[PDB]
Paper text:
Here, we report that the opportunistic pathogen Simkania negevensis, which is unrelated to Legionella but has a similar lifestyle, encodes a similarly large number of DUBs, including M1- and K6-specific enzymes. When testing the same protein (0.5 µM) on a panel of di-ubiquitin chains of different linkage types, complete cleavage of the M1-linked chains was observed after 10 min, while none of the other chain types showed any cleavage after 60 min.
To elucidate the structural basis for M1-specificity of SnOTU, we determined the structure of the catalytically inactivated (C82A) fragment SnOTU1–255 in complex with linear di-ubiquitin at a resolution of 2.5 Å. By contrast, the salt bridge between SnOTU Glu-185 and Arg-42 of the S1-ubiquitin is crucial, as E185A is the only S1-recognition mutant that completely abrogates activity. SnOTU achieves M1-specificity by a particularly extensive recognition surface for the M1-linked ubiquitin at the S1′ position.
Residue numbers in the entry:
A (entry chain C): 3 to 242
B (entry chain D): 1 to 152
C (entry chain A): 2 to 242
D (entry chain B): 1 to 72, 75 to 152
Write the structure that this text describes.
């Protein structure tokens, strides 16, 4: 891509110097620290005036009312869908030896991938419930990027086996290349394979209320709660 | 301008509209006041059907004009759209309706923009510019809806 | 004129069924309705509201009542609603106001001949002493209020050009002579200037969450009249003190 | 996609946008988050100015891209309402009357099709330019609202 467009690039415009930034320079983590929704709304919508922003603001506050007061921000590196899923999935794996074993068995069957070994080493550390280890896992940009890329690879290899629509749309729905956005149907397929339930919160700018996409059945108790804010995904910390 | 609308039950209603308002916008006003969903509304004026895209000025509708809600045409085809989760959506369409028009009807019932919808029939993705007849989609046929809503 | 099937009260057939256009005379809608609480009006117009345009109109109507008054008068949409709503609000101000009645009567004497001028003068003479019951009878008379409305149109066309621009330049486009032709909002501003009164016009906006207040003749001042613009139609708010 | 915006003060902010969002919509999101009015915003990316009509995809803006707010010779004119309210606009001699009515809308919330503009006792047509009417610096236009009803 052209020099003037690249992150960290420096150029001149009308006698003044400008320096593009990047995720590495801003220090934005792959998965942010636990953050109350009211703080997130104040961060993103402190001067809200537009109709789209007022709707997003009220829908975000309603989502917290229903699912939980805290969330994890997710870096928009193009893998936010699988990074938000991995974040919510890790909360479910914490202290769940049966689910960790089922997940580890799936990883063994996947084609080779550089990030599979480290992910297996990670889930081993959560067989006994350990909130502190989960916190360290989610705070490691390298660990969560590995987790995120493994979910993408996993979806591409296993979802086509579920039949249509995945057999027909896998490449359009879940691209292989890192940094390429993923379609929401990927979450539905993953829930079907892993036999878990997820609520995806579709924030709608054309309506006053959001839309809940629940997988795999329109009824059921969600184990994961993922929020779609425009072409971006965040992870809600589910309260019990 | 203030116009009249007569429902299928004969009840008479007034609407405060403007000449530039579209027929789709009138049906939206009819729903706000009387509750009839726009997808059930078939409006006529002076014995001529009103299309959703035109405006009142086009049909030289003015003050004191009366629009009548009438029964839909017999013989129209009912189709079904099933989501990834198994939810069944029921639509009223004609063989000439394009796939785009079908996605617009899906929007009116589900609140999902057309550009965020994929439609599949016979294991094939459907193109926006072709008609239901072009795909040999018949009465009571079932299409499949897959949402896009990509993000990263 | 206009095709038979479009005319009010016309009966025609469509796909094997008979349909009957209605009309203002058949529906019995008065020129000026009876006092009506805003919440009752909102329940009439927006009981199943779902669209963005309607929810904005609904919330703007409720805010208007909070600021100006709980009741309003519906106005028949015969094309004269601007002058009919003005006459309605103006009559509340004329009630018991001998000084304003004389100022209005003096203008009427100078206007070109018009059959509805004599009845309007006889009407306002009956309001020199405050009489709410007579006002109620006046506003309930379709014949009186139509006469009042047409006299205001005639008055605006004859006197507003004397104020100079923009009225001298736009009078025919702003206030048509023919009865039933819609009138532009600037006519209210001119009338307020001539009659030395203040009016708030509530412009209900479908593209914004709040309405916009057009105050005449000065952007400051206490309103004597409160007129509501609901799309291309005007209503009269009953001003509370 | 998640993009970056650097303000005139050097502050860096993130925005959750979509490829189809228009530049006018971007400025609205910048206001919602940072408070800068859109009329003060001049956005650049890779040394090219962004007009309110394009979208991010047209300027091949993607994730991690950085937009910079920069400082902006416009002609000052005045629009006086029927009541005497004075509106101040920045215009060019080539701007059409429709463009001026669009600027009035952004400051007053009145649609262009509900506005009449008068200069030198003459009504102005939407398709003609300010230069066609000899509208110069500090000229005063008159706004008369339509908003007809019946």
């Amino acid at each position: 891509l052209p020099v003037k467009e690249r992150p960290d690039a420096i150029y001149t415009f009308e006698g003044k110097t400008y320096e593009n930034t990047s995720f590495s320079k801003t220090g934005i983590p792959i998965v942010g620290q636990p953050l109350k929704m009211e703080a997130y709304v104040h961060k993103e919508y402190t001067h809200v005036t537009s109709l789209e922003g007022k709707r997003f603001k009220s829908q975000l506050e309603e989502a917290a009312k229903i699912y939980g007061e805290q969330l994890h921000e997710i870096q928009g590196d193009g893998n936010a869908l699988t990074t938000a899923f991995a974040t919510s999935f890790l909360y479910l794996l914490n202290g769940n030896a049966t689910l960790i074993a089922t997940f580890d068995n799936i990883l063994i069957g996947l084609d080779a991938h550089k990030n599979i070994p480290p992910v297996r080493q990670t889930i081993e550390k959560l067989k006994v419930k350990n909130d502190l280890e989960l916190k360290q896992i989610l705070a490691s940009n390298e660990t969560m990027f590995a987790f995120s890329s493994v979910i993408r690879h996993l979806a591409r290899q296993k979802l086509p086996e579920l039949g249509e629509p995945f057999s027909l749309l896998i490449d359009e729905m879940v691209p292989e290349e890192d940094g390429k956005e993923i379609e929401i149907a990927c979450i539905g397929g993953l829930c079907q394979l892993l036999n878990i339930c997820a609520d995806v919160i579709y924030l709608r700018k054309d309506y006053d209320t959001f839309k809940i996409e629940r997988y795999p059945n329109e009824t059921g108790k969600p184990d994961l709660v993922i929020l779609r804010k425009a072409a971006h995904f965040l992870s809600i910390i589910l309260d019990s | 301008m203030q116009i009249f609308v007569k429902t299928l039950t004969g009840k008479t209603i007034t609407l405060e509209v403007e000449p530039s308002d579209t027929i789709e916008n009138v049906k939206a006003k009819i729903q706000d006041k009387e509750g009839i969903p726009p997808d059930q509304q078939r409006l006529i004026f002076a014995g001529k059907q009103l299309e959703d895209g035109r405006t009142l000025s086009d049909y030289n509708i003015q003050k004191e004009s009366t629009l009548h809600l009438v029964l839909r045409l017999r013989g129209g085809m009912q189709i079904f759209v099933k989501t990834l989760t198994g939810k069944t959506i029921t639509l009223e369409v004609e063989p000439s309706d394009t796939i785009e028009n079908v996605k617009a009807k899906i929007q009116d019932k589900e609140g999902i923009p057309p550009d965020q919808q994929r439609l599949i029939f016979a294991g094939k993705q459907l193109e926006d510019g072709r008609t239901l007849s072009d795909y040999n989609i018949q009465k009571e046929s079932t299409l499949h809806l897959v949402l896009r809503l990509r993000g990263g």
